[PDB]
A paper describes a structure:
The genus Enterovirus within the Picornaviridae, a family of non-enveloped viruses with a positive single-stranded RNA genome, is comprised of more than 100 serotypes. Human enteroviruses (EV) are presently classified into four groups, Enterovirus A-D (EV-A, B, C, and D), among which EV-B, the largest group, consists of over 60 serotypes, including all 6 serotypes of coxsackievirus B (CVB1-6), coxsackievirus A9 (CVA9), over 30 serotypes of echoviruses and more than 20 newly identified enteroviruses. The capsid proteins ([name], [name], and [name]) adopt the classical eight-stranded anti-parallel β-barrel configuration with the N-termini residing inside and the C-termini exposed on the surface. Most of the uncoating receptors bind to the “canyon” sites of the viral particle, dislodging the “pocket factor” in [name] and subsequently triggering conformational changes of the intact particle to release the genome, albeit that SCARB2 binds EV71 outside the canyon.
Author numbering:
A (entry chain B): 12 to 258
B (entry chain C): 1 to 233
C (entry chain C): 1 to 60
D (entry chain C): 1 to 179
E (entry chain A), G (entry chain A): 44 to 284
F (entry chain A): 99 to 195
Amino acid sequence: RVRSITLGNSTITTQECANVVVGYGVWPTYLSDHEATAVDQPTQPDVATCRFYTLESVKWESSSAGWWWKFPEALSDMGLFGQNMQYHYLGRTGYTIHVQCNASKFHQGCLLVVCVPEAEMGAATTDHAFNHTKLSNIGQAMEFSAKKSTDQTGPQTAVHNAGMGVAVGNLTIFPHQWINLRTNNSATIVMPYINSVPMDNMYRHYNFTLMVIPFAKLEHSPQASTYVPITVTVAPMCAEYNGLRLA
Amino acid sequence: GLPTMNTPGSTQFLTSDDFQSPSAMPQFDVTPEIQIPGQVRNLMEIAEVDSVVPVNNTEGHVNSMEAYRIPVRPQTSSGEQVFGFQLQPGHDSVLKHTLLGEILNYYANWSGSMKLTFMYCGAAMATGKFLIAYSPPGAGVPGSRRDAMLGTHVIWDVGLQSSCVLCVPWISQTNYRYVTSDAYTDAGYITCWYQTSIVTPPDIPTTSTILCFVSACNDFSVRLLRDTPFITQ
Amino acid sequence: GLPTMNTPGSTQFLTSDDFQSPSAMPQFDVTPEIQIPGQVRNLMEIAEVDSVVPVNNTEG
Amino acid sequence: GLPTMNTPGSTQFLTSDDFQSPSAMPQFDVTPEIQIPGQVRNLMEIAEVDSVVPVNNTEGHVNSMEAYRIPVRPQTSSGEQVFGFQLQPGHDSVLKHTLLGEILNYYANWSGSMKLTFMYCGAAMATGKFLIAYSPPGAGVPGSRRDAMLGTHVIWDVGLQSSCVLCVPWISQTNYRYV
Amino acid sequence: PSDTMQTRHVINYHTRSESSIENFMGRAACVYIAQYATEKVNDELDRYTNWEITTRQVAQLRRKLEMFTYMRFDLEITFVITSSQRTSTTYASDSPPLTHQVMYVPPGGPIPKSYEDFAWQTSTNPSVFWTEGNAPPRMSIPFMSVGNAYCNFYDGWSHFSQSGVYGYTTLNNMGHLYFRHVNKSTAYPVNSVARVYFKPKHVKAWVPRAPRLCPYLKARNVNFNVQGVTESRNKITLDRS
Amino acid sequence: RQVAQLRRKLEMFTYMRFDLEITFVITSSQRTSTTYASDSPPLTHQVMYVPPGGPIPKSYEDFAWQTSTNPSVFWTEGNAPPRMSIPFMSVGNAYCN
Amino acid sequence: PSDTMQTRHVINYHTRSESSIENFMGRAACVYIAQYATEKVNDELDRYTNWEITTRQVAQLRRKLEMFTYMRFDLEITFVITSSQRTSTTYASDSPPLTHQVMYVPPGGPIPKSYEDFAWQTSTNPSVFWTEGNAPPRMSIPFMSVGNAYCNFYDGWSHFSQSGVYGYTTLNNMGHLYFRHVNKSTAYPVNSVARVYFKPKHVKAWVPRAPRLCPYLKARNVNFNVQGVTESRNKITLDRS
């Protein structure tokens, strides 16, 4: 029923079926080894930096609007992956994202776990430019709101517009997975490297934003647990950076 | 030289022309394309994805997530209606801003089949039956659970399945106006009825939520592309 | 380019012309035709039907 | 005649056109070409020739031959820097007027590899070691001989070789402005 | 006699050719209206005018474009240039035919900063000369990005990590478009209007995105006011048995 | 149904199905002014075909003249007469007289 | 939002077609602007004008040419001729269409020295007659040198050994270009401007030369003021560890 996966260290556990969703039917892979003439030569992490990075868990209460993380910026202080982001200038990588909800049989609700490529967000105070720390901190979960935002230096965090000016119910053409606590508690999304260029600066460009939005709100007896933790575990797969040597 | 004659329509600009153009920039090597994942060659691939329907679109519920949450409450009277809407995805206010609805809005004549998915998001120990009735494009909205049972219906048991999928035929609406006020339609309906109730054990809340999803099937045919009336610059 | 000469009757509109026309609506699928009964390809088929003659055409 | 229609862009002059032209002078025999030595069919053949870099481009050293002469002096402190410049041959003032730099200047987007050759022009009995460090396009200028040794470097021994050749990758700079 | 939408039974033929990317995007749309005059009236209206080629100023085209993250197309530009005289006292003149110059400035090319500038004679700037009364002039621009595709959305910055302008990238530079009269003068001033029409050819798209709900406030941002997800009704249920 | 000689030749059959070839003979003349001395540029005309489902203009300077799904024809005076071609545009299988 | 140059990783395709001699030299460049009038105003502006065909007057073309010692190409000349009226009191007229005559005079042919000269009717002088409002006229000149290639540089004299003019040779005679109106008169005077555009076709080059550092002072010499070999900086070394 259960299966243990190890990537260097440590081991996480998962179920035998788990409904893995590959991004656009494309498994993440390398640049097919046509790296001739030594003018634009790439470099692997060691191999590898491919280990499970677990983030700090969030608390899904009954009034939680949702959360988001911007990648690769949510793994900036994360081991060797966070050091290759400052030792190299250009980089490309793919990801495996696990989102587990540790609920009971007496908790109800539904979550939508989206991976939105190039989730360009709008400002709360329009005509104003926002701070970069109100978009993504170093590993923190930036959260949506139920009301509209009037912040003079932040983004628009109204969840029914999803920060991008669209309808939140239409966020299913992106690679997504439903977590209905009646049926599931986990979600595996495997995202490849999607960009217009084969490599880019990792500190400057957010490739995709992972979004966890509750569509049916969390509802329970008052005698149960009231916070229902959600754990996001990210393993970067097939990372690649620019060559740092001569000739 | 070659004797020629200039036919009518000679030095004109028809905006639907497909003539060869003189290259303003020859001698230029175009950057080659790479394998970017997720190439799409037809907008029916966007309409063939399930998107969440805002069935609870009252005020002020349209400015929340509560528009998507269909309320399931404990019932006093037997056989009450849960929800209901018209099955035209280009004019009905619950379906015109969905994924299928935007694309449909772009085109004037379309015909095909819809695909409604209802998802129960209550507790795992909640048990109940719902009656999802279908009304054909002639007539009409039923008035009771018995009138709904005597037509096309699906009994959705909550205790057995968490989801209910049903494919609806005869969806083709053609509008000859740009914006419609309000252009009488003869589409069908979908209504849901309380067959029994939702039965719960202790220490589980009595209220729950149904989610709705809509898409198309792989036969959907649009025609006569226009501009959408959802932009008013 | 190709050396050409414009013959008389060049930028004119003769109403009996049979030239190719630029399609104002390309990219449009025409509705296909079905078997409608009673197709007629020549107006002699209408004249080849017996019709009643008003021989007693006095007034009133 | 042949029924024709005049498409848009008909009686216009686009300066990038490639149409056949009416010969103003037919009936004229062109003088035949001979074998002139040194035919060139591509301007990359001009950029593929080593030209001398004015590294010592201070004032008033730019109006002399002293711009090309990199000074090697007796040192008091150990591990001092000899010279240094940025590796963009289209914008950097030491490389933009070289042979590679003029051609690069003509084009807006270029990518390839440079080839730096350092030649020691001292006496035959002078012996020394130099450390030629390379910094990748991310970052950055090192601050010491130890920081330079801990990256990509080549130890050039004067007493063994008179020249030092090193090929540098990742040179591609695209500018969207004229000046 | 109006209006009803009807079901109207259809034979099985299943057309889908009008829903391809070529038939969806490839329509001749007016993207810019350029106004310039034979003589200068004011700073606004001057002997010459300009336009940076962007695809974010006409909202009906912008929303059809922004349904995909990455596009790649060739541009077919065509110009409908008309002229009219200003409200003078007398208009009696004998004018020669006006010749217009539409110059395309590539990324990397020099832009004019006035009339009689040297940038109008640059050989690497392709120009089109067209006299009034002829067929409308037409240029063709290829795929002009340094990267492999245009990006309608850029979740990133343009400066030192985390600094600069959010959402702006230089991977969407298509160039500039400069308009002027080649004639030196007229007897009386003449205002001209140049309607610019874009037709994207050989369109390829990647990573489809949700259609935009809110209206547009700026042509360089994705900023928005919050809006309801759909229109409102009175009840979740239906009546009239 | 507005030209009677065409309407009677059409209404001899219940169901028709054809393609349309439209061509325009556009002439211009000045109003009866006091003086006519001017130097005018050539007039450009716009003939827009609005399909069923497309937006119609309700004034001059309307947004419907710039709609990309509305095919227009731009023609300067003195040239050959402009010509459009409309296909069979009915939702059903034939027109009904 | 401006401006940065970036590295921007590129797939291996290695384009070189824009660096060929045909793509480098073969661009339509404006080489001369000819001004002439319907009626004579002064010695400068007269019924007719002339130009000896040289390639040393536009500096952006001259520097791309002078990167090679020996060139050999065919010339494609095209003319953008516009007309405008002078600042008269009244301009009310009914003019017939103006016809222009552009005459190419070969090396060895007779040049006009006035209007109504006999050299405009010479059958060995190819002329082009073009009415205003039509497509721009275009001539094509072949390789016209007596020697086997044009020479951009001539380290020699033109007189008795060591005497004459330094650097001048008759191996670069391409001919003359004469412009006039064919019409006899107008009611009111009309000034015309004829922009001359060169496009070198089938270009072959030999013996590449160093690019010019100094600016140009004369169009027939290689004279120069002395200049620094490059721009100046403050230090030979780098800071900011």
